[PDB]
Design a protein around this ligand. Structure first.
Ligand SMILES: CC(=O)N[C@H]1[C@H](O[C@@H]2[C@@H](O)[C@H](O)O[C@H](CO)[C@@H]2O)O[C@H](CO)[C@@H](O[C@@H]2O[C@H](CO[C@]3(C(=O)O)C[C@H](O)[C@@H](NC(C)=O)[C@H]([C@H](O)[C@H](O)CO)O3)[C@H](O)[C@H](O)[C@H]2O)[C@@H]1O
Ligand SMILES: CC(=O)N[C@H]1[C@H](O[C@@H]2[C@@H](O)[C@H](O)O[C@H](CO)[C@@H]2O)O[C@H](CO)[C@@H](O[C@@H]2O[C@H](CO[C@]3(C(=O)O)C[C@H](O)[C@@H](NC(C)=O)[C@H]([C@H](O)[C@H](O)CO)O3)[C@H](O)[C@H](O)[C@H]2O)[C@@H]1O
Ligand SMILES: CC(=O)N[C@H]1[C@H](O[C@@H]2[C@@H](O)[C@H](O)O[C@H](CO)[C@@H]2O)O[C@H](CO)[C@@H](O[C@@H]2O[C@H](CO[C@]3(C(=O)O)C[C@H](O)[C@@H](NC(C)=O)[C@H]([C@H](O)[C@H](O)CO)O3)[C@H](O)[C@H](O)[C@H]2O)[C@@H]1O
Ligand SMILES: *[C@@H]1O[C@H](CO[C@@H]2O[C@@H](C)[C@@H](O)[C@@H](O)[C@@H]2O)[C@@H](O[C@@H]2O[C@H](CO)[C@@H](O)[C@H](O)[C@H]2NC(C)=O)[C@H](O[C@H]2O[C@@H](C)[C@@H](O)[C@@H](O)[C@@H]2O)[C@H]1NC(C)=O
Ligand SMILES: *[C@@H]1O[C@H](CO)[C@@H](O[C@@H]2O[C@H](CO)[C@@H](O)[C@H](O)[C@H]2NC(C)=O)[C@H](O[C@H]2O[C@@H](C)[C@@H](O)[C@@H](O)[C@@H]2O)[C@H]1NC(C)=O
Ligand SMILES: *[C@@H]1O[C@H](CO)[C@@H](O[C@@H]2O[C@H](CO)[C@@H](O)[C@H](O)[C@H]2NC(C)=O)[C@H](O[C@H]2O[C@@H](C)[C@@H](O)[C@@H](O)[C@@H]2O)[C@H]1NC(C)=O
Ligand code: NAG
Ligand code: NAG
Lengths: 175, 323, 323, 175, 323, 175
């Protein structure tokens, strides 16, 4: 895509994740599990839906062909009428095809982005409290129970509350 | 040793739904939306409540002039649209032509209902024979003629000048039709109308028409070398139409009240009534689709999707699918 | 302890301008640019320096033929464009029709200036009556006639064959007008022009017209059952026009020099002159705008923005504004 | 969206900064104050201005409707004329509307990138001489006078001249 | 001491190729691809194997009727397309008009080959003089006439009624041409055709034509006040055409079998044959290009690129180049 | 660009690298040398080739003008006919021009992005085992032979295999 996230640095999506479009996998003392980010997928479903209503509404007012008859001494205007009607059909066929192609690629680069923006979101909350493995994952320098990780997902994460525990762990291995 | 971990990830599934972009072909996505209807019922249906007027092997000219092979359509109900075959068999039974036919057909595309009424009874011609007929226009074995017009010939051995008039006292406009017969030779001319030099005058508030027969040698068509040329006008409410003729006059018997104007068409289809019902009809089949687009046929009538020439129109809604 | 700081940030303001995108609606931005003109002055104005020809209750036909109710227009100045009402009251006062009217009109839309000249003085008809007049064509309560043509009738009880010819010695082309009168019956024919069987020949280097009156009964229009049928032609410089008639001739008196051709139009508007000036005129009002687009009316003349059917076209120039 | 910047990591724009589109807030021993980034604000005004001039110029040669009259026995050709003119008015309306929509979203994502490109312009210059707060701000590990911050704004910034001041300050808190 | 280093980078060169975008002009790129053909050979070529029919100073009418100055084209070979000059000198030699000419010329755009045949031998007019000639129709210094039609005048002092008939027994359809002469005055009329009141009848299964001369005073054109008007029809295979006249008849001598139908056009060009060959022809030059677009001329024939009015169409394939 | 890579924070393209579109320059104990990233360069060639084939094929169906003649009492339909054919030529000229301008810019932002994907591809494999110079280059905290750098190019890089060594090199400088 436009930076390398969806089928990028995090190679692969999670078939196991069935609650949403963008989300999290968590692994702590209380097992593992998938959890979808409700807010940014809803914001993405809204936009993809509006895009789809926008593209249909842009074609509502579009040329409509009418059968006209012409006699055998009106072959010029008959050709005029045909060329004109085929003309508008080729034009709108072009418009419909091109908008779909153009918006398809943008929709993919949009999903792509929402995955990276959600990633810098967590990467900015955690900072030096975790090591960034570079596969889309973060390995905490402290323990994060199922209530600490709820905090990173909805922007509630408290950084100083885990700052010191984490500082010790990078120094423990570096000591 | 490895501690606690969180991962950021996206959705995937077993979808084989493919999309295209400008740069990439056959891209597999999790969710797509087909926006192109590609199927029809192959049948001619009602349009909402209203049945089409399906002429069979009759042409619009056959129906309106009353080609005897078309008596099914002598009094048609209100229609939604008109279906005509590509090459109708019962057109003008007697050889000839319909003047401004394509303009009449186009006028007709804006009409949903006629009420046919008699403006001149066959029994009002006391000084003329009102029974001119032809083998080219057969009814039930015998030689007949168009029903909405009358072939007038000399009575005894005379054709008095006709001065005949009709006022449209009806509220609605009248499609009035008439004709002129072109004989083959001066003798045929005299055998039929007595007078050698004839005319037809037609007057209205806007029409000031004069017709003269063209007596000439022509190709035999249906065994006939004679020709019949037909004319039409819309008589506004409260206007009158004046006919004066001394021969070759094919006079009006029936005319049509324009009861209802509306959205309509004349479809070219060889299909026939399929006792179905639809809100979108094409000449090759009807459409019941929620799609914004279709590629069935450019000539539709009703509440239709938009026509495009595409073979496939699929929108990506979800994201690229993970192996 | 906390030291020195730098931050990266962007502009915001008190802007309420919203724009749209494909994905997002009513988005508020810091700076936007409306590119769509939505207002006009509701007037018919001059185009650059030049006043339109505003026919009031006169049609193009009435003006050119010289309907007596249109005497305001006997000699109009160079115009920029022409305005005609949707249904002018002063059209053809005597009932009838103008031949190839829409083509004449289309020609007229390519002309900015006529110079009217007399090609035949009325005091040149010494063997015919040139005072034909009608109630359908009133001037000041009493019966008059078109001013640019003459109704010629028999003098004493004779109608000599008229042979009159006119050579366009002017450098510019002449729009020349004439007509034929269609009486209702043979009796009217003799009362007016004596001779029963009449004709009109009109000849030019390109025109070879023969007209014969259609004498027949028609509906009353303005109390008249008669009709007047009008013809026009462009007589090129150095060509002559030849008239031969035996009756029913509505002869030319004045004709028009085509002085200037150009981009012009015939607007259909109920508006009238608003004593203003514009570089862009629409049937419903003038436009003074730097916008690249407008949505006022599709039929414009002048240096105009481009028409779209949109209600809103707003370009975002600045960035998304934070609530 | 395609970013995680505008209403992203720097949540909100600066109403106090009215000199430009993209710029800086600075805070040292010598009070506070706003300074618009000269380079990226000009490159953004020109590019956006050019876009609005390209789009208007691409529409100058566009269909022009003209009134044509037809008589009552020319209804086929009158209908032809009407459909042709509405056809072109619709086609160009689609062209106008759709291009405005398409360029608007690109324009918003354009301002957007310039916020992230300006942030990464500084973040790459600062490196380990500053702490990345994750709110669009950087906290210096050294002292930066009102002439030091001029160096970060125009990309001349000399890193080693402040490395040690910063290295040592990193030693105090990590000690 | 400095250890190992890795860097991320992209391609560059000394390329000067520029492209444009919505936001940026004259951007130098590493790789671009011109998609717009802008050059032609300035010549008229064959279209694939087949040479065009280039009328020189003859119009299609001059050719088809056989203007004596057009004998070069009496029997032309199969053509790929037709080239006519903008205002050919040799048109209708005798002043007048060709009826439904533009319709015939359009018909001509789907025909690649005529084969001319004799419908009436010149020596078959035993009761009429078939040697009518005119100064307006010069051949080699003397007065001549169209070669494919014949000017019949009275013989001795009679113009017996002509009844001439022809059945198209060929497999292919016939283009048949004829005409009527409009004299200046009744004296010329009797001087030429004896009978004062004349007609021309032409009959077919579809055609029922009656012509009557229009005798009137007209401008001299090439010194002539007479006019000649020409008519045509496509006589279907197995149909017959019937002529009846008692004067003013310009009778058919030759007609055209429509032997080969196809894609063709009538290009308007002042060019001449350039002994070249192409698969794409425009009125001002031929196209030998693999480009998807060209801007040479909108009216092309052959397997051509698509026309645009653009001066430049360049796609960026590579990336932005470092100065 | 819309990312700030091509002519952004990585200043300049490499005239010396003529084997591909995107790649690397590396300098260690086994000399220096350029190496074109085959993976992202062919995939960029695929898309750019297709885009150009998509743009040409979507115009295959495009209006073709025909000469129609009219007589002098046909001036309305002659005019209708002229406006109609000029109408369709203006539309397709707009379409061809606008599609080329719009896809050109997208093509520059596509190249711009691929430079960003390749840089972030490296940035995630190296992490704290290398220092980001901020000119598009990375300085290893260890020695990287012609098999170590071939490994980072194809995403094979093993982070723990240099994890311990890199830490010491970081403390040596922090000492
Ligand atoms: C009414 C009728 O039967 N007319 C035929 C005519 O009868 C003549 C008789 O009325 C007169 O008083 O005396 C002579 C004897 O000298 C005749 O007996 O005779 C003609 C010669 O056979 C017939 O022409 C033939 O007609 C064929 C077609 O006939 C019809 C038709 O079917 O269309 C018969 C209709 O009765 C007749 N209709 C009317 C209103 O007259 C029509 C009509 O005349 C023509 O169709 C108009 O063009 O014709 C063939 O055409 C055959 O080739 C021809 O010889 C008279 O039909
Ligand atoms: C010119 C005139 O007065 N005509 C009316 C006629 O008068 C005769 C006169 O023409 C003759 O030379 O001398 C005799 C006596 O020897 C008469 O005095 O009388 C007719 C019968 O009453 C009128 O018919 C009436 O026409 C009405 C329309 O009148 C007008 C009109 O205003 O349009 C009168 C115009 O003067 C006349 N113009 C000309 C040049 O003749 C026209 C014109 O005749 C028609 O427009 C031609 O179609 O008609 C009503 O139609 C009324 O119903 C009817 O009784 C003669 O009008
Ligand atoms: C054939 C001939 O001699 N025509 C001229 C005519 O001669 C008379 C002759 O036809 C008659 O039988 O006998 C008397 C004496 O007993 C005459 O001698 O006389 C006319 C009066 O001058 C001439 O008119 C001039 O014609 C010019 C055009 O002449 C042509 C032409 O070039 O088109 C000559 C052609 O031979 C002739 N063709 C035919 C088939 O008749 C045509 C044709 O008549 C006209 O085109 C008809 O529309 O005319 C000029 O028009 C000149 O202005 C005029 O005075 C006859 O030439
Ligand atoms: C229409 O009238 C013109 C002008 O008539 C001449 O000019 C007047 C001012 C006056 O001096 C008259 O006595 C003149 O005849 C006339 O054109 C002229 O024709 C004469 C011969 O008759 C020529 O000598 C003169 O050169 C010519 N002038 C011009 C400007 O052409 C037209 O008659 C003739 O025109 C020429 C061009 C020929 O085509 C000839 O056939 C034609 O009769 C006259 N037009 C008509 C249709 O009568
Ligand atoms: C057509 O027939 C009707 C039925 O009589 C006529 O309408 C009536 O005409 C009388 C006077 O003759 C008038 O008092 C009535 O008001 C009128 N009825 C209606 C419903 O309009 C009509 O004759 C005349 O109609 C008036 C309106 C006028 O136009 C006059 O010119 C006309 O002669 C008949 N129409 C014709 C053309 O003969
Ligand atoms: C033109 O000449 C041909 C050749 O003789 C005629 O066709 C033949 O017509 C007879 C009947 O009269 C028929 O038995 C033959 O089969 C037919 N020939 C062929 C090859 O089909 C033709 O006369 C008539 O042709 C038929 C088909 C019919 O349409 C009839 O109306 C027509 O008169 C001649 N055409 C004319 C107009 O005279
Ligand atoms: C994509 O797949 C379809 C069938 O699944 C095939 O018809 C089409 O040709 C493929 N695309 C290309 C570019 O070959
Ligand atoms: C956008 O704003 C207008 C302003 O009145 C409002 O009428 C409209 O409903 C809004 N549309 C949406 C989709 O919110």
């Amino acid at each position: 895509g436009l930076f390398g996230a969806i089928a990028g640095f995090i190679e692969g999506g999670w078939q196991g994740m069935v609650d949403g479009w963008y989300g999290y996998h968590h692994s702590n003392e209380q097992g593992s599990g998938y959890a979808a980010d409700k807010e940014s997928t809803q914001k993405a479903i809204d936009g993809v839906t509006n895009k789809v209503n926008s593209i249909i509404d842009k074609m509502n007012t579009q040329f409509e062909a009418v059968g006209r008859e012409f006699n055998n001494l009106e072959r010029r205007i008959e050709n005029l009428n045909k060329k004109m009607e085929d003309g508008f059909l080729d034009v709108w066929t072009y418009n419909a095809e091109l908008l779909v192609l153009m918006e398809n690629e943008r929709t993919l680069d949009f999903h792509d982005s929402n995955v990276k923006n959600l990633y810098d979101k967590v990467r900015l909350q955690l900072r030096d409290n975790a090591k960034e493995l570079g596969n889309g994952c973060f390995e905490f320098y402290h323990r994060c129970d199922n209530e600490c990780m709820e905090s990173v997902r909805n922007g509630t994460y408290d950084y100083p509350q885990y700052s010191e525990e984490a500082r010790l762990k990078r120094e423990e291995i570096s000591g | 040793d490895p501690g606690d971990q969180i991962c950021i990830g996206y959705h995937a599934n077993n979808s084989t739904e493919q999309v295209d972009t400008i740069m990439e072909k056959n891209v597999t996505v999790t969710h797509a939306q087909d926006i192109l209807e590609k199927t029809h019922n192959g049948k001619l249906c009602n349009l909402d409540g209203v049945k089409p007027l399906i002429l069979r092997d009759c042409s619009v000219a056959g129906w309106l002039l009353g080609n005897p092979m078309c008596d099914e359509f002598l009094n048609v109900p209100e229609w939604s649209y008109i279906v005509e075959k590509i090459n109708p068999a019962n057109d003008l039974c007697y050889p000839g032509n319909f003047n401004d036919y394509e303009e009449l057909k186009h006028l007709l595309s804006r009409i949903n209902h006629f009420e046919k009424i008699q403006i001149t009874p066959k029994n009002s011609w006391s000084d003329h024979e009102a029974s001119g007929v032809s083998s080219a226009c057969p009814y039930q074995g015998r030689s007949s003629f168009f029903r909405n017009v009358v072939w007038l010939t000399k009575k005894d051995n005379a054709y008095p000048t006709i001065k005949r008039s009709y006022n449209n006292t009806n509220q609605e406009d009248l499609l009035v039709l008439w004709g002129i017969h072109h004989p083959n030779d001066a003798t045929e001319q005299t055998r039929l109308y007595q007078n050698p030099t004839t005319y037809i005058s037609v007057g209205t508030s806007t029409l000031n028409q004069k017709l003269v027969p063209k007596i000439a040698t022509r190709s035999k068509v249906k065994g006939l070398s004679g020709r019949m040329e037909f004319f039409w006008t819309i008589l506004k409410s409260n206007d009158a139409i004046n006919f004066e003729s001394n021969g070759n006059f094919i006079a009006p018997e029936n005319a049509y009240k324009i009861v209802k104007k509306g959205d309509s068409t004349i479809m070219k289809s060889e299909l026939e009534y399929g006792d179905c019902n639809t809100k979108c009809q094409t000449p090759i089949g009807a459409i019941n689709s929620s799609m914004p687009f279709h590629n069935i046929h450019p000539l539709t009538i009703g509440e239709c999707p938009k026509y495009v020439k595409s073979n496939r129109l699929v929108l990506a809604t979800g994201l690229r699918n993970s192996p």
